Every structure is written in structure tokens, then in C-alpha cells.
């Protein structure tokens, strides 16, 4: 039975509006409704992994697991195994996988983050799951961010608290937050970003939705505009939105958007918005292809419609050689040549690098770089040809070219990371000096760049 080099992943997000679901929710898992939808000819083909995020979920874990498993069994005739379930208040994440994957999945983590202080602590935050699928790390975040059209900045703050404080993946990757810990990271939920148009334009917006003319609405979507201005979700992807706004509907129909201000809304308007979203971030040059992104039309218990997204995701096998794991493979090496970091910091400390990768027995600390001034104000940290030669555990190019090197640049004075990035070993050539580049971030915000050349030796 061969190990896969691709799997498909279903991501669902649904704000259930504190109501039980209807008796049939299969359209959700089949990616049927509006937007980029899945071909009828695939309906019986199970996804490898289903990740369900709910918000305002009134069900017990048991109640929801029974509905989910019975739904998937009805669609696929497969009895899925529960990988993980984690709930914070009424925010929940469930991960189900095909039974054949049970001994491919390991290192299962769960965590949550509560966002806000005093007033603003008590119902918003995130839950997450991570695990290994053979040689591939997968992370999943379901977040319910702050509501309200005039709180986009609070949403952006919620995002930065969640990526700082959600403790998933390999705790040895200590300089790295979740945005660097996984081959593939999926972040979804009721992100609560709104279409920022005047209240008076509510009926105009509704008209546009009935005409399926989303362009003038998406140009005002706060998540798209905040992302374009690098305020949030830096280096994440989202598939083009081709489905109607998923909020705020009258319940038991989808024929009416309920946007007017009410006591129940705190006298806020809820103009039709794409609150419910799926984004991802994968390591450079790993296969990830969105194959569906849309909303259901027939699930009407909530004032939100469910959103689905499906992905092809590249995966690698758990590699064993005669040598590694448990020793180095003298036939392999990674050399970083003529490298320099460009940092936005005003601080004058010395800096050193750390190289972290599951292709190394443990992380490698460099010597300090040489600080110079850039022509436009910047700190440039030069490493020359002084960087430690990295000794991978396996030299086989079928393994090594699929790996990645995480880089942290740290202050000698404080040992704190000023920037984190990732370099793919999927090179155009081995034994050849080739340009490398990564942006550097810290707390998910841009702090600089790392660039130079790499020379990779494999056993071929």
C-alpha cells in the first residue's frame, strides 16, 4: 500500500448563530451551493481530512461529532476517525480523517487563545489543531474575531494575539510562531471583516448581490483591503470570492439580508459581508491548490451560511535511510554563501542566526554577523561565507529537495528573534550556487529580509 504524495483537505467554517443545525448538512461537505463548487462526479470520493470550525456552536462535542460522522458516512459510506476536537466557549474545531490515515497521523496538538481584556475577554478567540501526516506538518486555526463594522483594527489585533499565543506544532521551534511551524497552515472562521460602505447604501448592496455583481462590494471588503495594506494576514493566500456575502441573513430562508440596527445588535447595522473565510499559508514551493471555495444555499438555521474550501496538499513520506534518522549522512550538506539580513530595527546589538529544520538532528546557531548601514537608513547584517555548513540526517535528493530551512535572526544581547523566515530546498540544481530569499517577520509583521546564495549537496 503506497504512501501518498498528495491528500485533499476539506475546511468548513460555520457560525451557527446558537441554533441547532437542520437534519441535512451534506451540501456543506460536498462543496455545493454558490462560488467555486465541486464537480458532481466527485461526490462519493472522500477527502482525506475534514476540518470543521464552528462559532456560536450550541451543541455538545458529542452531539456535533454524531452529526458530522453520520453526515460523512451518508455521503461516502466511510466511517471517519476522530483526530481531535477542541472547544473554547462556543468556538470549536473538529478534525476527522479516513480510517486508513490513523497510523499516518501523529503529534496531535490542540490549543486555544482568548482575545481581549476585561470587557472584551469572554467570548472571542481561536481554537487550533496541529499534527504530522507522515513527513508533513499540518496546522488548523478556527478564529471568531471581534464583531462590528468599525472594529477592523481590533480584528487585526486579535489576529496578532492568536498567532503569537496559540501553542501548536513543534515546541523545539521556539523562535517561530504558528505562521512558520507548518508545511500547510489553514486559518478560517468568522473573521468578522465587513463590506465598508455607507449604511444608506444597504439596499444598493442587496441589489448588487441579487445581480451576482460582487466586484464593487469586494473592493470594500475590510479583509481584502487590510491585507492589501499589509495590516493583517501577511503572506497568507485566499481564493477569489465568487459567492454572495454569508452574513447577515434572516433565518429559515436565504432570500433576505437582515442588516438594519436593532436592540439585539447593540444598535449596529450589519451590512451584507463576507464574515466567514478560509485562508492558508504553505511553505515555499509546496503543492497547494484550492479546488473549491463557496457557501451553501440550503442550510438556513443560522444568520450565517456555511463556507467550504477544499485543497490539494502535497505531502511527503516518513523517510528512513541506512544512516539518518539517528546519524548524519556525510554525502549531504547545505552551504549558505554571501548572505545578509536587511532589518527595519533601529537597535544596535550584534545578531546571529538560528537554522531550524527536521532535516537536521537539532538547530544550528551561527556566529555573529557584521553590521553595516544601508544607503536608505537600514541595518544590514552581513554573514559572508562564515555560516556553519549544515549536515542533514539524510542525503537522498528525493528527501532533501522536499525540505525547508527556517531562519531566525536573534539579538546577541537579548536572544530574542527580530525576524523569522523560511527557505525551500526545492532548488533548480544541486552543487550549484543559487539565489535564496525570504522576507523576515516577527509577530507576523514584516521586520526585514534575508537573501544570499545556497549550494546544496545531495547523494546525487
Ligand X SMILES: C1C[C@@H](c2nc(C3CC3)no2)CN1
Please give the Cα distance from 125 to 164 (Å, whole number): 12
How far is residue 262 from each of residues 71, 193, 247, 248, 302, measured CA to CA in Å?
A: 36, 20, 16, 13, 17
In the complex with ligand X, the residue whose CB is nearer, 41 or 211, is: 41
437 forms part of the interface with ligand X (CB under 6 A):
no
In the complex with ligand X, the residue whose CB is nearer, 73 or 106, is: 73
Task: Name the one range near ligand X by CB under 6 A: 70-78, 95-103, 260-268, 322-330.
Answer: 70-78
24 forms part of the interface with ligand X (CB under 6 A):
no
76 forms part of the interface with ligand X (CB under 6 A):
yes
Q: Which of 1, 41, 77, 253 touches ligand X by CB under 6 A?
A: 77
The x, y and z cell numbers of residue 194, run together, are 465587513
Residues 37 to 56: which contact ligand X by CB under 6 A?
Answer: 44
Residue 310: Cβ within 10 Å count: 25
Please give the Cα distance from 451 to 439 (Å, whole number): 9
Smallest distance, ligand X to C-beta of residue 96, A? 16
In the complex with ligand X, the residue whose CB is nearer, 77 or 211, is: 77
In the complex with ligand X, the residue whose CB is nearer, 10 or 351, is: 10
In the complex with ligand X, the residue whose CB is nearer, 26 or 459, is: 26
Task: Name the one range near ligand X by CB under 6 A: 12-20, 74-82, 305-313, 425-433.
Answer: 74-82
Smallest distance, ligand X to C-beta of residue 42, A? 11
Longest dimension (CA), the chain: 70
Residue with the three cell numbers 476517525: 81
The x, y and z cell numbers of residue 370, run together, are 557584521
Task: Give me the 245-284 binding string for ligand X, x by CB under 6 A, dash otherwise.
Answer: ----------------------------------------
Smallest distance, ligand X to C-beta of residue 75, A? 6
Please give the Cα distance from 5 to 48 (Å, whole number): 12
Q: Are 416 and 404 within 8 A, CB to CB? A: no
Task: Name the one range near ligand X by CB under 6 A: 69-77, 99-107, 257-265, 337-345.
Answer: 69-77
In the complex with ligand X, the residue whose CB is nearer, 77 or 375, is: 77
Task: Name the one range near ligand X by CB under 6 A: 72-80, 109-117, 341-349, 400-408.
Answer: 72-80
In the complex with ligand X, the residue whose CB is nearer, 74 or 240, is: 74
- Among 454, 456, 451, 455, smallest CA distance to 382 is for 451
In the complex with ligand X, the residue whose CB is nearer, 77 or 362, is: 77
Q: How many residues bind ligand X (CB under 6 A)?
A: 4
Smallest distance, ligand X to C-beta of residue 22, A? 18
In the complex with ligand X, the residue whose CB is nearer, 74 or 385, is: 74
In the complex with ligand X, the residue whose CB is nearer, 78 or 337, is: 78
Smallest distance, ligand X to C-beta of residue 73, A? 8
Smallest distance, ligand X to C-beta of residue 46, A? 8
Smallest distance, ligand X to C-beta of residue 50, A? 15
Please give the Cα distance from 309 to 166 (Å, whole number): 23
Please give the Cα distance from 404 to 285 (Å, whole number): 10
Smallest distance, ligand X to C-beta of residue 293, A? 24
Please give the Cα distance from 353 to 409 (Å, whole number): 5
Task: Name the one range near ligand X by CB under 6 A: 3-11, 73-81, 180-188, 373-381.
Answer: 73-81
Judged by the rule CB under 6 A, the positions of this chain that interact with ligand X are: 44, 74, 76-77
Amino acid at each position: 500500500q503506497p504512501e501518498p504524495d498528495m491528500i485533499t483537505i476539506f475546511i468548513g467554517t460555520w457560525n451557527m448563530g446558537n441554533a441547532p443545525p437542520p437534519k441535512k448538512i451534506t451540501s456543506w461537505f460536498l462543496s455545493k451551493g454558490q462560488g467555486k463548487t465541486r464537480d458532481d462526479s466527485a461526490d462519493y470520493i472522500p477527502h482525506d481530512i475534514y476540518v470543521i470550525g464552528t462559532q456560536e456552536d450550541p451543541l455538545s462535542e458529542k452531539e456535533w461529532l454524531e452529526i458530522l460522522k453520520h453526515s460523512l458516512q451518508e455521503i461516502t459510506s466511510v466511517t471517519f476517525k476522530t483526530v481531535a476536537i477542541h472547544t473554547l466557549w462556543n468556538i470549536r474545531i473538529v478534525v476527522l480523517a479516513k480510517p486508513e490515515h490513523e497510523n499516518r497521523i501523529s503529534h496531535i496538538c490542540t490549543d486555544n487563545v482568548k482575545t481581549g481584556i476585561a470587557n472584551t475577554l469572554g467570548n472571542k478567540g481561536a481554537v487550533g489543531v496541529s499534527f504530522m501526516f507522515n513527513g508533513t506538518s499540518l496546522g488548523f486555526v478556527n478564529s471568531h474575531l471581534t464583531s462590528g463594522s468599525e472594529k477592523k483594527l481590533r480584528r487585526n489585533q486579535n489576529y496578532m494575539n492568536i498567532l503569537r499565543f496559540l501553542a501548536l506544532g513543534d515546541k523545539k521551534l521556539s523562535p517561530f510562531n504558528i505562521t512558520h511551524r507548518f508545511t500547510h497552515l489553514f486559518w478560517f472562521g468568522d473573521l468578522n471583516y465587513r463590506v465598508d460602505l455607507p449604511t444608506w447604501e444597504a439596499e444598493t448592496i442587496i441589489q448588487k448581490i441579487k445581480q451576482q455583481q460582487y466586484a464593487d462590494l469586494l473592493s470594500h471588503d475590510q479583509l481584502l483591503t487590510e491585507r492589501r495594506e499589509q495590516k493583517v494576514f501577511l503572506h497568507f493566500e485566499e481564493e477569489e470570492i465568487t459567492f454572495a456575502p454569508t452574513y447577515r441573513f434572516e433565518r429559515l430562508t436565504r432570500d433576505k439580508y437582515a442588516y438594519t440596527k436593532q436592540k439585539a445588535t447593540g444598535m449596529k447595522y450589519n451590512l451584507p459581508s463576507w464574515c466567514d473565510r478560509v485562508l492558508w499559508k504553505s511553505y515555499p514551493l509546496v503543492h497547494v491548490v484550492c479546488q473549491s471555495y463557496g457557501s451553501t444555499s440550503d442550510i438556513m438555521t443560522s444568520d450565517h451560511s456555511p463556507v467550504f474550501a477544499t485543497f490539494e496538499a502535497g505531502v511527503t513520506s516518513q523517510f528512513v535511510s541506512k544512516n539518518g534518522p539517528g546519524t548524519v549522512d556525510s554525502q549531504g550538506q547545505i552551504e549558505f554563501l554571501r548572505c545578509y539580513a536587511t532589518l527595519k530595527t533601529k537597535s544596535q546589538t550584534k545578531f546571529y542566526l538560528e537554522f531550524h529544520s527536521s532535516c537536521l538532528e537539532s538547530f544550528v546557531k551561527s556566529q555573529e554577523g557584521e553590521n553595516e548601514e544601508g544607503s536608505e537608513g537600514e541595518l544590514v547584517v552581513k554573514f559572508g561565507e562564515t555560516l556553519p555548513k549544515l549536515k542533514p540526517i539524510i542525503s537522498d535528493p528525493e528527501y532533501l529537495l522536499d525540505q525547508h530551512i527556517l531562519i531566525s535572526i536573534k539579538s546577541s544581547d537579548s536572544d530574542e528573534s527580530y525576524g523569522e523566515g523560511c527557505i525551500a530546498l526545492r532548488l533548480e540544481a544541486t552543487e550549484t550556487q543559487l539565489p535564496i530569499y525570504t522576507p523576515l517577520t516577527h509577530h507576523g509583521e514584516l521586520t526585514g529580509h534575508f537573501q544570499g546564495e545556497i549550494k546544496l549537496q545531495t547523494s546525487q
